[PDB]
Amino acid sequence: KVFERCELARTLKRLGMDGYRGISLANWMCLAKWDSGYNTRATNYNAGDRSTDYGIFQINSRYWCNDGKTPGAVNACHLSCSALLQDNIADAVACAKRVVRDPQGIRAWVAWRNRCQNRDVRQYVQGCGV
Numbered sequence: 001k002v003f004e005r006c007e008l009a010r011t012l013k014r015l016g017m018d019g020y021r022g023i024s025l026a027n028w029m030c031l032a033k034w035d036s037g038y039n040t041r042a043t044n045y046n047a048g049d050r051s052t053d054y055g056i057f058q059i060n061s062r063y064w065c066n067d068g069k070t071p072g073a074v075n076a077c078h079l080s081c082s083a084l085l086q087d088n089i090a091d092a093v094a095c096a097k098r099v100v101r102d103p104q105g106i107r108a109w110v111a112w113r114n115r116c117q118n119r120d121v122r123q124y125v126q127g128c129g130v
Contacts, residue, residue, distance in 0.1 A: 001087040003038040003056070005029070006128035013130045015093045021100045028096075029124035030116035031109055032056050040092070041085055055084035057096045058111070064095055 003011070009029055012018070018025040035058040036042035044053045051062040051070045061070040065081040077095035084092050099108055106112050 001040045003032075003040075005033075005038070005124070006130075008032060008038055008056075009125050009128040009130045011089065012093070015090065017093060017097075018130070020097055021105060023100060023106050024121075025130055026121040026125045027106060027112070027116060030119075030121040031106065031112045033124065034115040035109060035111040040087055040089060043085070052081070054081045055092050056089055057084075057092050057099075058109070059084055059092065059095055059099070064099060 009025060012025060012028055017023075017028050032038055035053075036056050038056065040056045042055060042058065044058065046052065049062070049071075051060050052067060053060050054065060054067075059065055059077070059081070061067045061081050062072055063074050064077045065079045065084055066073055066075040067081040077098050079091060079095055084095065086092075100106055102108065107117075
């Protein structure tokens with residue numbers, strides 16, 4: 001499913017993402033936009049290390065979810081990567097919360113560092129009613 005901007009902002013708010021571990025909703029929105037274009041079906045294979053990033057939050061198969069074909073997988077979220085390709089993002093949100101409980105927080109995602117860090121991210125939630 002490809003979410004509309006404000007539809008996703010309200011969805012994330014309901015799921016407890018606003019201010020989770022000190023991370024504002026706008027920051028999560030900036031990440032989802034740049035890493036997947038708000039698309040739950042997005043997948044990106046990393047030919048070099050043989051891992052795959054899944055879903056709206058592009059969660060990696062080496063560290064977080066299990067797809068059974070990634071060398072050195074840890075499966076920290078204890079989830080099948082399949083769960084990250086659903087239209088319902090509850091599982092993706094639960095895993096994203098797990099990722100940011102590590103010290104690095106949202107810095108774990110390169111897309112956030114590249115397109116969001118030290119930037120005005122307010123535009124992402126403007127007019128959404130959140």
